Amino acid sequence: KDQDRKSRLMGLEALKSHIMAAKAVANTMRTSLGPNGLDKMMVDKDGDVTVTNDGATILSMMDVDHQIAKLMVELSKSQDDEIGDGTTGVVVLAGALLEEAEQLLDRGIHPIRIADGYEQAARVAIEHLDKISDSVLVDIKDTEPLIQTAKTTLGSKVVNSCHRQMAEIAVNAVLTVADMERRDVDFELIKVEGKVGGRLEDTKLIKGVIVDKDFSHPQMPKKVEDAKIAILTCPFEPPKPKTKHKLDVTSVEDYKALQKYEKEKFEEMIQQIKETGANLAICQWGFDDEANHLLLQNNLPAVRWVGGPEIELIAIATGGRIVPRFSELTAEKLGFAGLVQEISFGTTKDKMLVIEQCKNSRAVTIFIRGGNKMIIEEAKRSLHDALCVIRNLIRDNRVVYGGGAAEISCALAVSQEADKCPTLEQYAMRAFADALEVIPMALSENSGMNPIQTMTEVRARQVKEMNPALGIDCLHKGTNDMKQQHVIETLIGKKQQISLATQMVRMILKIDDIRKPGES
Amino acid sequence: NSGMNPIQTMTEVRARQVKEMNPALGIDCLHKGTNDMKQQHVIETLIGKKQQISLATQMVRMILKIDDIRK
Amino acid sequence: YQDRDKPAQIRFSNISAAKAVADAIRTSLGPKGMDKMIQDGKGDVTITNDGATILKQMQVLHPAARMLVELSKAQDIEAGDGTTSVVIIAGSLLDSCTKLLQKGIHPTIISESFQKALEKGIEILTDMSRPVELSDRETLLNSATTSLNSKVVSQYSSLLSPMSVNAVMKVIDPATATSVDLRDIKIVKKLGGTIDDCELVEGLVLTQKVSNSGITRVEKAKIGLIQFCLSAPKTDMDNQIVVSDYAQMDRVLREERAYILNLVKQIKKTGCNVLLIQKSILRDALSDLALHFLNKMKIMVIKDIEREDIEFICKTIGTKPVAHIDQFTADMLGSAELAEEVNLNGSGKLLKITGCASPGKTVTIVVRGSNKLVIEEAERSIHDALCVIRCLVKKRALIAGGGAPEIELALRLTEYSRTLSGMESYCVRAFADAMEVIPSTLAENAGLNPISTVTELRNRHAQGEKTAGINVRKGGISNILEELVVQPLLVSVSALTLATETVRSILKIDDVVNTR
Amino acid sequence: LSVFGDRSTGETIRSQNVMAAASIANIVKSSLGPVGLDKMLVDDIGDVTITNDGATIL
Amino acid sequence: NIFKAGADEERAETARLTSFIGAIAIGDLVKSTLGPKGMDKILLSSGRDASLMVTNDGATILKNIGVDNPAAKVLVDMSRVQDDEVGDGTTSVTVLAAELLREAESLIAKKIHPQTIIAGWREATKAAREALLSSAVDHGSDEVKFRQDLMNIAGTTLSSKLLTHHKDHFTKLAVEAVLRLKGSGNLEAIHIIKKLGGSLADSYLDEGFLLDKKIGVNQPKRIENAKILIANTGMDTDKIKIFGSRVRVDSTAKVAEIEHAEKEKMKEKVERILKHGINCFINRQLIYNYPEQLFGAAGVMAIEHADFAGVERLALVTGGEIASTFDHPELVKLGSCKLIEEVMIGEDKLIHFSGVALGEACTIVLRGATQQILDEAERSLHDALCVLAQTVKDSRTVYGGGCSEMLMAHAVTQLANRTPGKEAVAMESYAKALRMLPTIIADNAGYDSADLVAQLRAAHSEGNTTAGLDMREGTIGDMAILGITESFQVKRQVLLSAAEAAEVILRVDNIIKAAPR
Amino acid sequence: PGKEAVAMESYAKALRMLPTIIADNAGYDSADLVAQLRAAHSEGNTTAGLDMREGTIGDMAILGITESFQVKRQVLLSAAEAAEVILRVDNIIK
Amino acid sequence: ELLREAESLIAKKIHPQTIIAGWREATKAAREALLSSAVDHGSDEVKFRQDLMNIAGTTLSSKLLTHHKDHFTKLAVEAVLRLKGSGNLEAIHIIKKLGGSLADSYL
Ligand SMILES: Nc1ncnc2c1ncn2[C@@H]1O[C@H](COP(=O)(O)OP(=O)(O)OP(=O)(O)O)[C@@H](O)[C@H]1O
Ligand SMILES: Nc1ncnc2c1ncn2[C@@H]1O[C@H](COP(=O)(O)OP(=O)(O)OP(=O)(O)O)[C@@H](O)[C@H]1O
Ligand SMILES: Nc1ncnc2c1ncn2[C@@H]1O[C@H](COP(=O)(O)OP(=O)(O)OP(=O)(O)O)[C@@H](O)[C@H]1O
């Protein structure tokens, strides 16, 4: 049904319409490339304002209606776990590949020759990256050059003023939850929380689990050195339901009887913590005033009003289990911790619970601070980009010089190997060499320099001067050769940037018909 | 025409001709030192001034007496 | 010049919107001025030439043109007269700045120059005025009949004039105090009789009834005011009255009796003998059972009191309102010697309370009359006579009428313009020409030539004094002092200060924006 | 100006007031005297009353 | 089918024009109110007539107007975050950021990248901040000379408001409250009393932390060794913050059973208070007459109806605590006061303390005719007491009124002599925008802006870093001789905040608008 | 003085456009070459100019690029006199 | 650009008579900087002869003669230096002949 009111696009003009749907996405994000990338204003659906230039926030928030532009949204679900640094880089690469393919479509070449020709030239550019890559941590492990490379990818944003102490934190967080010889870094084992107030220098590395809940009473001790934590859902008190107790009393004969019936329950379940051997009582609900007076005398602290996901996040790090009531209390499901402390922040009444193990754990949490809440969500993503580069260093310590140095040397090898291809895929190989030069050309355009004058000077430098590649001066430094300026990208991040860009042009050029049924 | 305020220069010379001194002072249109163009040697004739206010007034009387043009 | 941005066009829009308000009301000035006809939305046509009604009936929506509306409202409280004349002064002032704004003058320079014209304009009206005394009863009596003769009621101008002078002398000490409050002089009017049957009560007179309290006469009355509704127990929330038998139906009637009598017994401990209840429409302020419980305790019943009548009571006897029965104390009670109900043939059923003996001086003017149109214009003649006495206390000076200070203000400020310097010379020149509209309006409204009258009057003021002016009775230029047309100084000297701050506020407004 | 109606002043309200008043005189012009002519008083219902007395006309 | 159904996209040529037009229109909205002779504005809401009000304050205009453009919305709250922490310079941070973008569009029309102007403005900010460091002078001694400098910055803050007419009387009270403080800049030690009656010149001052509330029915007028204990409990009647509860009333005896429960529950509450061993009691809710008779027989002053400014300010001027619960005694720190005197100012019962610990507290008692004058005067003293407390923490002052701005325009121009080429034109854009800040001040006063402001360029170039604009005469005079100066920290805050928010607009070249729900 | 200062800034901007058009007609970056020459001639160094052949800023003393003084005095006097006539013109009578 | 920048001055409420007084004072200062930058040659005529080719090279710029500009600068300086007379250019003769390139021009 519904044949009337249906948009159709077929013929040769549907091929250029899919190019124009992809050219609108690339031209917006060719200005936000590099550390000198221009900011983007985001207007929320309810009226909030948040400004950023990150690539992963652009693709997730751009409510596009074209299905060709919706295919550009799909690459962000798999790229942020792989490269983390070239989200703006693959969009301009997929767009500029279709720019020269728009010129190739005027000649009459079929897109199944262009999609196969782009896959042919991508294997030459991938092979050229492995020949020019240099190692860092071959045959040994070291933590000193890993912080220097992490200082460059972190300081590309506004958090460059405190990039030193935050780069040492992300190195020790990955090395605790994961080993370098195992090469299995888990992103779910590293959590990042934050609260308003303070500076960026007050970032502390908590090896364990943090929850934003205080103790059940202000007279509770703030130091638990014993590794026995009972995590339950019902507090050690007379039993109350989940929503509303609503105890009915008739007269003073029922109030006197229910008080003695509650005084037995106030004496039993409080002393039921000592028969098992637990010290901390993390319960989902709070405690009463009569229970808090008894917890002070027996030296047993407790955490009140712990939320839904806050319970399960503690028991994974400490190795505990969600206990439903007091009858299932065993010593095997009790949590383990080295230091449970409460840390306040000035006059703020947050008083979060800091559970530390004081050892090499398997779940580490990072608490960042700042003067505004928009900087805390920016610094969380800033450390998340730093976690992927260290993850790429563990899987492969070989690295390649970024900042346009790897892109120009790849364009020289592809154009040299294009003459050895005596078929109709030769024009697609020369198309791949021209689109590879656009990413270092957009780097110099965002820096305020002439884009063509800056590009061809490195062409005479990477050929006539020296065979090692030289970078493009993007941060207005003294000279070229960004290897001396310590701006180096990863090899896996540069190989998958080429492969994902070829994958999206192959899926776009093969699509030649769209049918959109409207309303009836 | 001298590139100054037309009203501020006018209302300060008329205040100068009343308050501190009874003889008249001129307007320094050539951007000289100060007023009192007798020291600046700016001198016009009396018949050239008595006929300036006369022929300007008599041309108004010829215009105000004309109330119909028919062609 | 280029002049791309245009913020002065909003100033020209603010001037021309306020100019249409004064030009439409200009011909209604003077006693021989033209009247104005209005049409309401329902189709009512009412002929009225009073300037305070037409500005209330114009209903402007422009923000700049609305500034002349409260300018007339502030004149009725400060002076009580001179109403439209402030608008034509402020309207001709903004016409004079239209020639000034085209010349390139910034409006903030005109604002500091118009205040200097206001400081000089007060000084001209001071020495030219005639100082009189407030203790002299002949001065306040003779000057009030001359102002009331030009009003609607002139045949009773010899009777309402000594009633207004003798009312303020019991309230204000003559020639010692400066503050005069017209709210302490309440005018009570009822149908029946003539205006000659009038009584000056030193206490207070209420228009209500003591029904159904059968006392009607109490001595040593301790008057107290209660704003709480003494009625049945009523709950605004959800409640229920359970019924069991016929004897239970008599118990809830006894519960309504015992709850009110518990509140009545609280009144008897403080010695209160007269209860005042505020007017309430949303619920019953007084039930039927509470009317009988105050009859047994010999307590007078007084209800149906307006909020403005409460202000007349607390300054008379010193009674403070209470919000609830638990806050009822003995310190919030007044003092009275006798309270009764006097029902005359023409005065009606009124509550005459004499013997105040309290800190506070209020009077009451009870005016009788047969028709409804008689007593309403008798109160308007009293309020016009009460304002000319209030204007004489704050300024112990008198001036002539018919625009005679306006011509003297236009001539002395022209001589003051030759001695000034800077931008302030031309603003006081435009301030002098804007004051000549008020005699030019009185020249046009009297049937004379508007240009030939004010030009002859300027030459009469250069050689003489402020005695020369416009006489609307004979229809020509004559001696206003010999014509006995004398107005107080506070009518004119507040007409200049209020119009100058409005013109300074209008010229200082640059842009108009709308918020949400 | 933004007001709650239409405003009109000058001599044009003087000429409109005398043309509306003299038109009522033409209703009682021919009916004056003992030989005055009858005039039809059309009601809103549809019936008509033939009166020549000028007091019942106005 | 790229952006339809509510979605709109601003391109590279569209978002560059939208961010410049939207910021200038907000900048030109409140540029007329700049200076001591600024114009007023009409503010009224659509569909309502009672909201007609006229105020020339820069923050009062910008807090009321709704903002539709997102590029201008980041400029409006920039003036709001200047208003709370500083309270002065709200008009200057708007028009300087607008004039910076007004000269930025001339550079983009001259084919200059916006990121080039960002690197030029960061170098011009440090040179303009260094010129305020050289011209700043402190006053460690000569407090009679420091009393003059506090009165100069008080009249500059009190200008362009309702209190600029009687500012000679208010500057003798706001400065005197600062000198009697002599410590930290906490404004909780100074109370503002709004009482009806009297003019602006009839304002009184009390150095014993005068309170604007009346207490009890029959209170003792003099008490020695006043022991302060503040609480927050309901003491008037039952159902304290409980809605929905009902008591069955069958007869008049059931009404007295509520009162018999009221007399018993209140008696247990006062016994919890008097077990602490105190002499004065403060509560946020009203206290009934029956616990008032228990407090009067025991010799304890019951202070009723405390607001949020009552509990927060009296906890530090007396040395006490909030103490919301008193179920168990001997676990709270207690206050200290020597004598409590009942003074009648404005025909109201006013609470005057004397001889308290940390006795630097004061109170400026304002007098006005109605509440609209007093609420404006409460804001007129609030923004003045913030910048007066700023000079106590840092006594550096600079010459204002176009002196510090033309010195800043000369310091950036000297940096334009030793700079690369592409950063030189961007720093010249910072130099022309700093000269426009005394230009709109001179244009708002009606003087010749081409004669007064451009003469300061030739005056400040060859020495003479004291001459500025004198709006009383309209002639360039010495600011140090006439006594016109401003604070250094506020003048540094309006330089940094107007340059940082101008960095946000030039960094944005694309505005993405989502679908409105 | 004040009003004479804005007029002198317009004369300095008009003389800065003469190496700007030459740098723009030669294809080089006119916003970089001329703006560097302003900072070069500001604090000493009154010898460097524009080099069309090499495309950078070079020393005019070693390059051998000079112009006559009587021609430079004639162009500066005639262009200021031609701008003197049209600036005083406010009405055209045809 | 003298009239282009002065066009925005009339938009800034500046009278055009004051701009001419600002340009007349700037004319004497611009001639003063030209007098300090003027380098004369009272002696060392072999260096002064090297400056004469720089004047001939500057006048012949942007012309059709850029193919053999070095040959025309040598013939331009030999005509004026052998003259040593007034500025009247009637003494030199210019011949219009076909055939030959620009480098074969004779003096
Ligand atoms: N200091 C530098 N100098 C020159 N080039 C740099 C420098 N730092 C980073 N780059 C280049 O900029 C590129 C990253 O650009 P950009 O910052 O726009 O993406 P991103 O925002 O990091 O991506 P994501 O949105 O995933 O964080 C890298 O490929 C790198 O080569
Ligand atoms: N008896 C009189 N004889 C002559 N002129 C008079 C007389 N009474 C009033 N005037 C003049 O008429 C003007 C007021 O006219 P009108 O009666 O329309 O207004 P009003 O209500 O009395 O005063 P205002 O306009 O101030 O409210 C005054 O300026 C005054 O000079
Ligand atoms: N008497 C004066 N002489 C010279 N300049 C003055 C004078 N008074 C104020 N200024 C200048 O006016 C500027 C302040 O502008 P304005 O008064 O419009 O805003 P503001 O009232 O300070 O802002 P806020 O309302 O936030 O306090 C100051 O920078 C100061 O240089």
Coordinates of C-alpha atoms and ligand atoms in Angstrom, one line a residue, chain C residues 28-31 50 81-86 146 150-151 401-403 438 442 470-472 485 487 491, ligand 2:
Chain C
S28 CA -11.7 72.0 27.4
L29 CA -9.6 74.5 29.5
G30 CA -11.3 77.4 31.2
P31 CA -14.9 78.1 32.4
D50 CA -14.2 67.8 33.6
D81 CA -7.0 71.1 41.4
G82 CA -5.3 72.5 38.3
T83 CA -5.7 69.2 36.5
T84 CA -5.8 69.7 32.7
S85 CA -3.5 72.7 32.9
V86 CA -0.5 70.4 33.8
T146 CA -14.5 83.3 44.4
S150 CA -16.9 79.6 38.5
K151 CA -18.0 76.0 39.3
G401 CA -5.9 83.7 37.9
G402 CA -6.6 83.6 34.2
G403 CA -3.1 82.7 33.2
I438 CA -2.1 78.6 28.7
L442 CA -7.8 81.1 27.6
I470 CA -7.6 87.4 31.0
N471 CA -11.0 87.9 32.6
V472 CA -13.5 85.3 31.3
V485 CA -10.1 85.9 40.7
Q487 CA -5.9 81.1 43.0
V491 CA -1.9 74.9 42.2
Ligands
LIG2 N1 -13.0 82.2 37.6 C1 -12.1 82.2 36.6 N2 -11.8 83.2 35.9 C2 -10.9 83.2 34.9 N3 -10.1 82.2 34.7 C3 -10.2 81.0 35.4 C4 -11.2 81.0 36.4 N4 -11.1 79.7 37.0 C5 -10.2 79.1 36.3 N5 -9.6 79.8 35.4 C6 -8.5 79.4 34.5 O1 -8.9 78.2 33.8 C7 -7.8 77.2 33.9 C8 -8.5 75.9 34.3 O2 -9.6 75.6 33.5 P1 -10.5 74.3 33.8 O3 -11.7 74.8 34.6 O4 -10.8 73.6 32.5 O5 -9.5 73.4 34.6 P2 -9.6 73.1 36.2 O6 -10.0 71.7 36.5 O7 -10.2 74.2 37.0 O8 -8.0 73.2 36.6 P3 -6.9 72.1 36.1 O9 -6.9 72.2 34.6 O10 -5.6 72.5 36.7 O11 -7.3 70.8 36.7 C9 -6.8 77.7 34.9 O12 -5.5 77.8 34.2 C10 -7.2 79.1 35.3 O13 -6.2 80.1 34.9

